[PDB]
Amino acid sequence: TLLKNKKITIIGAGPVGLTMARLLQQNRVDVTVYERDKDRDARIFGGTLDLHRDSGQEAMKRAGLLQTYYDLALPMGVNIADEKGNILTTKNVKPENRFDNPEINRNDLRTILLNSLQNDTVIWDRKLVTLEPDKEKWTLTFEDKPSETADLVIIANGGMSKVRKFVTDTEVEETGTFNIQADIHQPEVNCPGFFQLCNGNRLMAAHQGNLLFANPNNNGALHFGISFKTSTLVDFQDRNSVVDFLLKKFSDWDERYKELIRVTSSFVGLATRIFPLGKSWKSKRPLPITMIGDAAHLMPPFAGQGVNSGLMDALILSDNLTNGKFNSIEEAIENYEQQMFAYGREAQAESIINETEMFSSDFSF
Numbered sequence: 001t002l003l004k005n006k007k008i009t010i011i012g013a014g015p016v017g018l019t020m021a022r023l024l025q026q027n028r029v030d031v032t033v034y035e036r037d038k039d040r041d042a043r044i045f046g047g048t049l050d051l052h053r054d055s056g057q058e059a060m061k062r063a064g065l066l067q068t069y070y071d072l073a074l075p076m077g078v079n080i081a082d083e084k085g086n087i088l089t090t091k092n093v094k095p096e097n098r099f100d101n102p103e104i105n106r107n108d109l110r111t112i113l114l115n116s117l118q119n120d121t122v123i124w125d126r127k128l129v130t131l132e133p134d135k136e137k138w139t140l141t142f143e144d145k146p147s148e149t150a151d152l153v154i155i156a157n158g159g160m161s162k163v164r165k166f167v168t169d170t171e172v173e174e175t176g177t178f179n180i181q182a183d184i185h186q187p188e189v190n191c192p193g194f195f196q197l198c199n200g201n202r203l204m205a206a207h208q209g210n211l212l213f214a215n216p217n218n219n220g221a222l223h224f225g226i227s228f229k230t231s232t233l234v235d236f237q238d239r240n241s242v243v244d245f246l247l248k249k250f251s252d253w254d255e256r257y258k259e260l261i262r263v264t265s266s267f268v269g270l271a272t273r274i275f276p277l278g279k280s281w282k283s284k285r286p287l288p289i290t291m292i293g294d295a296a297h298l299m300p301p302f303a304g305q306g307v308n309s310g311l312m313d314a315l316i317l318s319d320n321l322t323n324g325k326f327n328s329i330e331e332a333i334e335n336y337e338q339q340m341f342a343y344g345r346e347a348q349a350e351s352i353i354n355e356t357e358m359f360s361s362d363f364s365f
């Protein structure tokens with residue numbers, strides 16, 4: 001009733017936006033997702049995602065995708081290593097924990113979510129450039145593409161979104177660490193020493209404020225990231241400048257790690273950032289709008305916070321808009337944001353404290 005004959009548009013086909021779309025759509029809501037990626041075959045770069053029982057998994061369950069997530073996700077142990085290649089501890093998964101936090105590939109997750117949507121719910125190759133209100137509908141502008149309208153806009157296009165002003169003036173800011181990530185295909189061939197060191201588990205190592213994280217089996221490829229406190233001699237279009245840089249930082253490290261760096265083809269660098277939720281969001285907005293996911297609360301990832309907060313957002317917001325407990329769309333948005341500010345501020349504070357802890361000089365997992 002609340003959303004009757006209301007055209008809802010979600011900006012961004014990430015995991016949060018798509019989950020939001022499904023939870024709305026299954027309540028008979030007209031929902032469109034606009035995604036800048038040119039087609040659904042676009043590969044998603046990055047490591048795997050793990051859904052927690054009380055948040056991400058609950059969102060999948062309410063969407064009817066929990067068993068699908070289990071069917072595709074993969075339980076994985078963790079090895080803690082030192083710079084000399086020693087395994088300090090192996091934290092393996094007991095049966096009682098095997099489905100607690102199984103890791104799933106980002107493209108796989110996109111696909112199950114896309115498959116849960118009606119055909120053409122998601123419009124590909126639609127990069128939102130500007131969002132402007134009308135007396136009754138939003139006007140959405142796409143780069144070199146026809147414009148669209150909506151009665152309610154949900155910003156879900158990530159932590160670097162540029163279309164937040166009508167909700168908040170808050171700016172993203174850098175937290176002081178930097179990440180270099182890459183994929184190695186056929187790691188059993190290209191980086192065998194380090195591959196066997198992972199030994200089918202995720203691997204983490206810390207030495208001199210330099211942290212390394214790896215997943216040996218991300219749909220047949222090894223994904224890894226190296227992270228450090230920030231402060232440019234490095235061009236990421238020039239793999240040579242990156243290798244020279246990483247090999248200096250990892251001079252103390254075992255050759256198996258040096259092999260990993262030398263064989264990597266393409267490096268991706270990214271400054272860690274946070275969209276701080278300190279100051280409250282705008283009280284009066286021209287038309288119904290809100291934000292979910294990283295657009296709402298981007299935060300450091302080193303403690304495992306991230307997508308699950310965003311899936312919690314989709315769950316509460318979609319509930320509020322469709323559980324009939326609110327007199328207006330605005331009141332339903334108001335309640336969601338109040339809840340999200342509460343448990344989201346907690347997540348951010350945990351993520352900031354962990355970032356300081358892990359890149360401190362004494363850190364030893």
Ligand SMILES: Cc1cc2nc3c(=O)[nH]c(=O)nc-3n(C[C@H](O)[C@H](O)[C@H](O)COP(=O)(O)OP(=O)(O)OC[C@H]3O[C@@H](n4cnc5c(N)ncnc54)[C@H](O)[C@@H]3O)c2cc1C
Pocket residue numbers: 011012013014015016017034035036037047048049050126127128129156157158159179181225270292293294295301304305306307308310
């Ligand atoms: C190095 C690193 C490691 C991480 N590790 C983890 C981890 O282990 N676990 C975890 O839970 N989280 C992790 N995170 C965080 C996690 O990836 C995010 O919290 C999660 O992806 C949030 O999803 P989202 O849908 O809100 O945003 P995104 O995943 O960024 O999705 C945004 C979507 O919007 C699209 N988009 C962007 N601009 C536009 C536009 N103008 N118009 C239309 N569409 C647009 C994008 O193409 C994308 O499809 C990590 C992050 C980093 C940087």
